[PDB]
Design an enzyme around this catalytic site. Structure first.
Site, PDB file in Angstrom:
ATOM      1  N   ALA A  11      15.011  -7.596 -17.548  1.00 34.73           N
ATOM      2  CA  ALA A  11      14.113  -8.670 -18.035  1.00 34.73           C
ATOM      3  C   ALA A  11      12.987  -9.157 -17.075  1.00 34.73           C
ATOM      4  O   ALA A  11      12.068  -9.811 -17.545  1.00 34.73           O
ATOM      5  CB  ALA A  11      14.933  -9.864 -18.483  1.00 34.73           C
ATOM      6  N   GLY A  12      13.058  -8.861 -15.765  1.00 43.09           N
ATOM      7  CA  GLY A  12      12.002  -9.197 -14.798  1.00 43.09           C
ATOM      8  C   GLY A  12      10.653  -8.574 -15.101  1.00 43.09           C
ATOM      9  O   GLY A  12      10.515  -7.762 -16.016  1.00 43.09           O
ATOM     10  N   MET A  14       8.161  -6.398 -13.287  1.00 46.24           N
ATOM     11  CA  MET A  14       8.158  -4.933 -13.039  1.00 46.24           C
ATOM     12  C   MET A  14       9.271  -4.228 -13.812  1.00 46.24           C
ATOM     13  O   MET A  14       9.091  -3.082 -14.246  1.00 46.24           O
ATOM     14  CB  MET A  14       8.366  -4.598 -11.552  1.00 46.24           C
ATOM     15  CG  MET A  14       7.310  -5.136 -10.606  1.00 46.24           C
ATOM     16  SD  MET A  14       7.702  -4.899  -8.860  1.00 46.24           S
ATOM     17  CE  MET A  14       7.082  -3.244  -8.545  1.00 46.24           C
ATOM     18  N   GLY A 107      12.762  -0.700  -4.129  1.00 46.44           N
ATOM     19  CA  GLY A 107      11.779  -1.096  -3.132  1.00 46.44           C
ATOM     20  C   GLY A 107      12.424  -1.714  -1.916  1.00 46.44           C
ATOM     21  O   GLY A 107      13.621  -1.976  -1.917  1.00 46.44           O
ATOM     22  N   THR A 108      11.633  -1.965  -0.878  1.00 48.59           N
ATOM     23  CA  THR A 108      12.162  -2.553   0.356  1.00 48.59           C
ATOM     24  C   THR A 108      12.269  -4.059   0.330  1.00 48.59           C
ATOM     25  O   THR A 108      13.012  -4.609   1.098  1.00 48.59           O
ATOM     26  CB  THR A 108      11.321  -2.189   1.591  1.00 48.59           C
ATOM     27  OG1 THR A 108       9.967  -2.634   1.414  1.00 48.59           O
ATOM     28  CG2 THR A 108      11.376  -0.667   1.862  1.00 48.59           C
ATOM     29  N   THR A 109      11.529  -4.749  -0.520  1.00 53.12           N
ATOM     30  CA  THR A 109      11.732  -6.188  -0.650  1.00 53.12           C
ATOM     31  C   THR A 109      13.212  -6.506  -0.757  1.00 53.12           C
ATOM     32  O   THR A 109      13.954  -5.858  -1.494  1.00 53.12           O
ATOM     33  CB  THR A 109      11.084  -6.756  -1.907  1.00 53.12           C
ATOM     34  OG1 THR A 109       9.702  -6.390  -1.935  1.00 53.12           O
ATOM     35  CG2 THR A 109      11.221  -8.277  -1.932  1.00 53.12           C
ATOM     36  N   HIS A 163      -9.452  -6.584   0.965  1.00 57.53           N
ATOM     37  CA  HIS A 163      -8.694  -7.302  -0.045  1.00 57.53           C
ATOM     38  C   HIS A 163      -9.439  -8.482  -0.585  1.00 57.53           C
ATOM     39  O   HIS A 163     -10.400  -8.939   0.003  1.00 57.53           O
ATOM     40  CB  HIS A 163      -7.353  -7.762   0.517  1.00 57.53           C
ATOM     41  CG  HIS A 163      -6.310  -6.695   0.499  1.00 57.53           C
ATOM     42  ND1 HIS A 163      -6.309  -5.643   1.392  1.00 57.53           N
ATOM     43  CD2 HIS A 163      -5.248  -6.499  -0.317  1.00 57.53           C
ATOM     44  CE1 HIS A 163      -5.283  -4.850   1.135  1.00 57.53           C
ATOM     45  NE2 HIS A 163      -4.632  -5.340   0.096  1.00 57.53           N
ATOM     46  N   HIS A 164      -8.961  -8.956  -1.735  1.00 57.04           N
ATOM     47  CA  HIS A 164      -9.374 -10.227  -2.316  1.00 57.04           C
ATOM     48  C   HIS A 164      -9.306 -11.306  -1.234  1.00 57.04           C
ATOM     49  O   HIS A 164      -8.461 -11.247  -0.359  1.00 57.04           O
ATOM     50  CB  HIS A 164      -8.461 -10.597  -3.485  1.00 57.04           C
ATOM     51  CG  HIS A 164      -8.970 -11.743  -4.303  1.00 57.04           C
ATOM     52  ND1 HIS A 164      -8.310 -12.950  -4.381  1.00 57.04           N
ATOM     53  CD2 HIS A 164     -10.077 -11.870  -5.080  1.00 57.04           C
ATOM     54  CE1 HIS A 164      -8.982 -13.769  -5.174  1.00 57.04           C
ATOM     55  NE2 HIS A 164     -10.062 -13.140  -5.609  1.00 57.04           N
ATOM     56  N   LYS A 167      -6.164 -13.708   0.317  1.00 53.53           N
ATOM     57  CA  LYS A 167      -5.091 -13.060   1.028  1.00 53.53           C
ATOM     58  C   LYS A 167      -4.986 -13.583   2.457  1.00 53.53           C
ATOM     59  O   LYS A 167      -5.855 -13.373   3.271  1.00 53.53           O
ATOM     60  CB  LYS A 167      -5.339 -11.555   1.016  1.00 53.53           C
ATOM     61  CG  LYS A 167      -4.279 -10.706   1.688  1.00 53.53           C
ATOM     62  CD  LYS A 167      -3.581  -9.759   0.718  1.00 53.53           C
ATOM     63  CE  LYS A 167      -2.393  -9.074   1.396  1.00 53.53           C
ATOM     64  NZ  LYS A 167      -2.704  -8.702   2.815  1.00 53.53           N
ATOM     65  N   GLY A 173      -0.068  -5.464   5.108  1.00 54.41           N
ATOM     66  CA  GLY A 173       1.173  -4.721   5.380  1.00 54.41           C
ATOM     67  C   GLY A 173       0.962  -3.220   5.370  1.00 54.41           C
ATOM     68  O   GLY A 173       1.361  -2.509   6.294  1.00 54.41           O
TER      69      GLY A 173
HETATM   70 MG   LIG Z   1       0.317  -5.760   1.726  1.00 55.63          MG
END
Ligand SMILES: [Mg+2]
Length: 274
Positions: A11-12, A14, A107-109, A163-164, A167, A173
Site C-alpha cells: 500500500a505505500g 513506491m 533499497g538501503t534506506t 539539483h532543484h 535541496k 548523496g
Molecule cells: Mg541524493
C-alpha cells in the site's frame, strides 16, 4: 512461467507503483501484497494501486504465511520479495525472507553498513541471492559503471551535479557515491601541473577522494542531474544523467527482480549486475 513476486510495503507510495508495473509485466506475477496499515487490509492490491479490473490478491499483513506459501515449489522460477517497509522492520523482513530462501530486492534506506554485513552473512550461508540497492535508476547506474570503466584509462575527472534549489545537502548523496566508486580503484586523479590560486574561495568545488572534484548547482527548474567529465589531451568524455520526474526507479526494480534469480549471495549495488 512468470516469476512469483511478493511486495512488502504494498500500500505505500513506491510499493503501489511496483505492484502496478508487475501487473503490466507478463513475465512477473504478483503472488502477495503486504502492509502494516490496518486501514488498507481487505483491499485488492491491483485496484488499490489504481487500475481497472482488480487482481485476485488481497493486502494481507503477515509475512511468514506468505513466504512459506511462496517457497512451496511453484514449478516455475524461485520467488522474489521486493521490500518497501519502514526502517524499523527492514532488517527483520529481509532476514526473515532470506531464511525461507526467498530472494530480497530492497533499497538501503533503513539499513546501516553493519546490518548489510550481517545480511551478507545470512545470504552466503543460506546461498540465497539478495540485492541491496543504493540507487534504483538505470541511467545513474550505467553512468556509474561507465565512469568506473573509463577511470582506468583517464587520469582526470570532475563531477558536476545539479539539483532543484530546495535541496539542503551539498554535494548530493549520489555525487558522493559516484566519487567513492571512482576512488575505490586506488588511482589518483587530477595531479597538478600548476599551483592553483583560488582568487575566490570555493571556485574549484569540493575535494572528494583520490583527487576528485565535485561541483554542485542549485536552481529552480532542475530536478536531479549529474554529469561526469573525463579529460585527456585533445579529448573530453562526458557521461550525463538527467531526471525528468521521480518515478524512474521502476525499470531498475523490475530489473532487480529478474537478475536476483541468478544470485546465490548478497550484492550491493545494481551496477554489479548490469
Ligand atoms: Mg541524493
Amino acid at each position: 512461467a512468470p516469476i512469483p513476486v511478493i511486495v512488502n510495503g504494498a500500500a505505500g507510495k513506491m510499493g503501489r507503483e511496483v505492484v502496478k508495473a508487475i501487473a503490466q509485466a507478463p513475465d512477473l506475477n504478483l503472488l502477495g501484497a503486504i502492509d502494516s496499515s490496518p486501514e488498507h487490509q481487505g483491499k485488492d492490491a491491483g485496484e488499490l494501486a489504481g487500475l481497472s479490473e482488480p487482481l485476485e490478491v488481497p493486502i494481507t499483513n503477515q509475512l511468514e504465511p506468505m513466504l512459506g506459501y511462496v517457497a512451496g515449489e511453484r514449478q516455475g522460477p524461485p520467488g522474489v520479495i521486493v521490500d518497501f517497509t519502514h526502517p524499523d522492520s527492514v532488517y527483520d523482513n529481509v532476514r526473515s525472507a532470506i531464511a525461507y530462501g526467498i530472494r530480497p530486492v530492497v533499497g538501503t534506506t533503513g539499513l546501516s553498513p553493519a546490518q548489510i554485513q550481517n545480511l551478507a552473512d545470512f545470504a552466503e550461508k543460506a546461498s540465497t541471492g539478495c540485492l541491496i540497492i543504493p540507487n534504483f535508476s538505470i541511467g545513474m547506474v550505467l553512468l556509474q559503471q561507465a565512469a568506473v570503466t573509463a577511470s582506468q584509462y583517464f587520469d582526470h575527472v570532475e563531477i558536476i551535479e545539479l539539483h532543484h534549489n530546495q535541496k539542503a545537502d551539498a554535494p548530493s548523496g549520489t555525487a558522493i557515491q559516484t566519487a567513492e566508486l571512482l576512488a575505490e580503484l586506488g588511482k589518483t586523479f587530477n595531479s597538478a601541473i600548476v599551483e592553483e590560486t583560488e582568487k575566490i574561495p570555493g571556485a574549484r568545488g569540493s575535494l572528494a577522494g583520490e583527487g576528485i572534484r565535485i561541483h554542485s548547482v542549485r536552481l529552480p527548474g532542475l530536478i536531479a542531474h549529474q554529469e561526469v567529465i573525463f579529460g585527456a589531451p585533445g579529448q573530453i568524455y562526458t557521461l550525463r544523467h538527467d531526471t525528468s520526474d521521480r518515478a524512474c526507479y521502476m525499470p531498475g526494480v523490475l530489473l532487480a527482480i529478474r537478475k536476483v534469480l541468478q544470485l546465490k549471495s548478497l550484492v550491493y549495488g545494481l551496477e554489479k549486475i548490469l
